[model samples]
Target: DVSFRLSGADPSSYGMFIKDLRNALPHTEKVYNIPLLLPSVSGAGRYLLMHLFNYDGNTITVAVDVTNVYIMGYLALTTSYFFNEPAADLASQYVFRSARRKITLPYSGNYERLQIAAGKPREKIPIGLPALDTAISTLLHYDSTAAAGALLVLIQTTAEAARFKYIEQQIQERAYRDEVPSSATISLENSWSGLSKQIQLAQGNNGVFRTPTVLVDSKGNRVQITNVTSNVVTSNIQLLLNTKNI
Candidate 1:
């Protein structure tokens, strides 16, 4: 499907010969066409058939057996120097065709359980709700900069949630795949429904704990999370979402 240029010149020989061709390589198949435009030659000793292999540079020289000749094409031949099996011989065994879509697992964990279930637990919650409320209020007051800041966190958090969902799906599918045949569609559907409810109870709610990234900045520039404390907290949040503590 790919082609390369061919050019040749022979200064002093018994006949016109080819010396240079550009971008000819082994992967272009065993034989390919070459365009010939060489000096006139008149000799019976010149030959049309030439074998080129294991030569340096991108050119090959071949003696032309004619004079006052306008030749349009030349044949190039390559032989296998190292391997016995050709790529084409092994090509058909590996067919590339898509099968029915495979199911994968969902994000699963005891995500929010520790905080709610542990007896008498307390830590610096960082005024989380009030700070978020203030940011929302700033957005309502038409402060676009504040809105951008808040939206950055929102985007990152939602992305993590989506990633966790995919993780859960992959986990679920792997578990199901081991136990069921690939063609069992209805069983797979029922299994997914069962896992969804289980995940909803385990991760989405602690009675009612409804769960809620390169952060792009307002100027369309990529902004790194440089705050060490914020990075630690976000890391913990991700671990909580993804870690299977059960």
Candidate 2:
């Protein structure tokens, strides 16, 4: 029982991640493969890895040597340092032949409830609608630029969503090998995803709500947005979409 008790990804964090992904996608257009890094466990050498599939940055590694514990934080052996190789990463070197089981949470909650979710809500709101892809794809096929404006958000949202979905695997592969299970080289496409059909992006009804960041489906209803940074992504994606001249 203890052996199989490997540290899997955090379900709650992943849940919120999907929520963030869903909320952000409707406004995203023109996804950029970015190496988005954030501090995790603080000065303890912990960090969150959110690099895009084709991004140059790789996940940070935890050094196993006890000596470095004093030099760096606790287990911080990052790029251009201990490894000395920028191109190769611990995740790439220690390949795990592991097939991840993507967990799907039932789409729950409503905009009313979300407005008050200071912490993660017990009954989570669902992801974006399937029609978003259909709606955007149709737009994409006809208008590349317009579609990319949408795709940027759509793709980047799902892209980060997938990474959050793979946090456990990333740790297993990039962190200490002795603790984690033996694995395989997770193919780029196998682990990385741009978008999913699970979220609810567009809905139609008489309820209409539209802001620069907010959206309404074909007939009316506003697309769900339940994250604090819901507009933050919109701000960034919108900035990216507007700055393009070519």
Candidate 3:
């Protein structure tokens, strides 16, 4: 217990005395309730970190120093949590596993393919904040490069399709005056087979890929394709990569 008598003493002097007393007893116990502020958020694979000390009863209270009319800031709690040490650790492990499972669940086929690419292991990939962040960064770069290549491949395919259509149209136009050549039809079929091969090669069977094809128009401008077909592949690779690091 802390006790002091203040009567007829200047308020300023009394404040100074109390300050000195506090300084002399630095480790003295005092009661102050500072609760953690946890935001209510719901989602799979989400998590949050909070200091164990600030938790009280069912809720965590937030505390901050006053400066002007504003209070201090707090970290956003994105995950559900508790203060019990072993229990919290186990809960965290569960969350990590669940999160990783979610990431790889959609890409089960691609995940297995990547496993073959990375050397098959008995266990699943890991999951965590840093691991996920690294996966995202790496995947972003991989997606850009792969998508650009896929765009080029799709452009070549589109060009092939257009050229085949043009040849058929020419044959139809000439057929009015002369007999249509069956040889020309056979040639078109062969060209279409080659185009199918190119498309399949662009899809990268088992991560084995050929150099992507490019297409140019008659005007010499590079043909542009709208779709990046390789994004699905890259996204799956990203999930596979992140699952190993938890």
Candidate 4:
């Protein structure tokens, strides 16, 4: 035999197994032994499964773990694997129909070839690294309209918001509970740091959304943002809109 063979865990079972495996003690270090048996190699459909635990490495051994079993998901091993782990980790890396996190997967294929041969829908071409870098740079406002032209589109937002401050103060002044006048009150740019507490936004469904639009519905799924706002809807850029909507 040129090499030994082994069958992979079917996607659903593999994925279901991985999910239950994902529940870990997070901070606690617990070793898991996932043995890849060989001398048998086939898969219904091979999907890469990611690890969610600290994995040291695999040992090729004639004797694999037959007991003390815990956690699973190793693409497909062609040999008897002695995988060792100690910390927390797991990955997607799964099959097409079997393991879809609904998050964007970074896998790619030749679109035209796939379309011509397999009748797959040709999605828009994936943007290049430079385009994506530029997109990210602009989205994060890394360029202050000095070198980037298109970020210029976003430039006037500061001034519009500045003028909106005038209108805001004007609204307060008109109430007469206060006693200030305008034209002179137009200092343009006031900070828009919406208070970190006691703000409410009632949606069409009568929801007093105290959170900063935590639930975003996209791609037929309702995903909640993390408390780490910077990674989710981001900082001031999008937050201001929510504040103004109130």
For each candidate in turn, the TM-score is 0.16, 0.17, 0.17, 0.15
Candidate 1 per-residue lDDT, tens place, 1-246, comes to 111111221121101111111111111111011112123322332223222221122321121122111111122222111101222122212211121221111111111222233221112111122222332333222333333343222221212222223222222343212221122121222222222222334333432212212333324454433222332122212112111212
What are the lDDT scores of the predictions, listed in order? 0.22, 0.24, 0.25, 0.23
> Residue-wise lDDT of candidate 4 within 1-246, one digit each (tens)?
011111232323323432332221121221111111122212421112222111122211111111111112121133111112221012122222242122221111122222333233212212212221232233222222211221111111111212233323233232223222232222221122222111213223243334543332223344443233223212222112223222
Per-residue alpha-carbon lDDT of candidate 2 for residues 101-128, written as tens digits (9 for 90 to 100): 2111111112222223223321221122
Model 3 stretches with alpha carbons more than 4 Å out: 1-163, 179-186, 204-246
> Would you give me the overall lDDT of model 3?
0.25
List runs of model 1 lying over 4 Å from the truth.
1-128, 165-246
* Candidate with better TM-score, 1 vs 3: 3
Instruction: Put the candidates in TM-score order, highest first.
Output: 2, 3, 1, 4
Best by lDDT: 3
Give model 2's clash tally.
25
Worst 10 residues of 3 by lDDT: 236-245
Over the full model, what C-alpha lDDT does candidate 4 score relative to the true structure?
0.23
Estimate the TM-score for candidate 4. Answer: 0.15
lDDT of 1 at 56: 27
